[PDB]
């Protein structure tokens, strides 16, 4: 009985080396990940051409900067409920409605410089600098 249980030890740790050592020799989808943001780079010259071609994102901005007017335009004082209309002339002596426009303004601004480059090199970033054979090596070293 203790030799067939040395053996099956024995054995055991033989599987468990046979599989550390499966876990090192796989790291071939790393490189394809990294390959995928390659690609990503090829739609952002396109991308690169295309606003120069079509003009989308000027007609997007130019949309954006209009929403956010026609939301700083609509007028509290003439709408119901007159009494609370009163409070927008306290907001005269308070600028309210001012830091109200700031802040819309500089929602649109951050928005403004939210587009689909930023989001395409941050991706890429993201891709490029996530790991696994970093993660496979910790796993197979600190786990025995």
Same mark, same amino acid.
């Given at each position: 009985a203790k030799i067939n249980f040395n053996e099956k030890l024995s054995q055991l740790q033989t599987y468990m080396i046979q599989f550390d050592q499966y876990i090192k020799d796989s790291y071939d989808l790393? =490189?394809? &990940?990294?390959?995928?943001?390659?690609? *990503?780079? #090829?739609?952002?010259?396109? %991308?690169k051409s295309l606003?120069?071609?079509?003009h989308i994102r000027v007609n997007l901005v130019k949309t954006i900067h209009d929403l956010?007017?026609?939301?700083?335009?609509?007028?509290?004082?003439?709408?119901?409920?007159?009494?609370?209309?009163?409070?927008?002339?306290? =907001?005269? &002596?308070?600028?309210i409605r001012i830091q *109200?426009? #700031?802040?819309?303004?500089? %929602?649109?601004?951050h928005i403004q410089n939210i587009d689909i480059q930023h989001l395409a090199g941050?991706?890429?970033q993201h891709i490029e600098a996530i790991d696994v054979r970093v993660l496979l090596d910790q796993?197979?070293?600190?786990?025995s």
């Amino acid at each position: 009985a203790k030799i067939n249980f040395n053996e099956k030890l024995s054995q055991l740790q033989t599987y468990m080396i046979q599989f550390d050592q499966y876990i090192k020799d796989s790291y071939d989808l790393h =490189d394809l &990940k990294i390959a995928i943001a390659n690609i *990503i780079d #090829e739609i952002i010259e396109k %991308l690169k051409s295309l606003d120069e071609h079509y003009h989308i994102r000027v007609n997007l901005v130019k949309t954006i900067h209009d929403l956010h007017l026609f939301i700083e335009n609509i007028d509290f004082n003439k709408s119901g409920s007159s009494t609370a209309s009163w409070i927008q002339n306290v =907001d005269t &002596k308070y600028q309210i409605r001012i830091q *109200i426009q #700031e802040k819309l303004q500089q %929602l649109k601004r951050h928005i403004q410089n939210i587009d689909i480059q930023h989001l395409a090199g941050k991706l890429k970033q993201h891709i490029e600098a996530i790991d696994v054979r970093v993660l496979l090596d910790q796993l197979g070293t600190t786990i025995s």
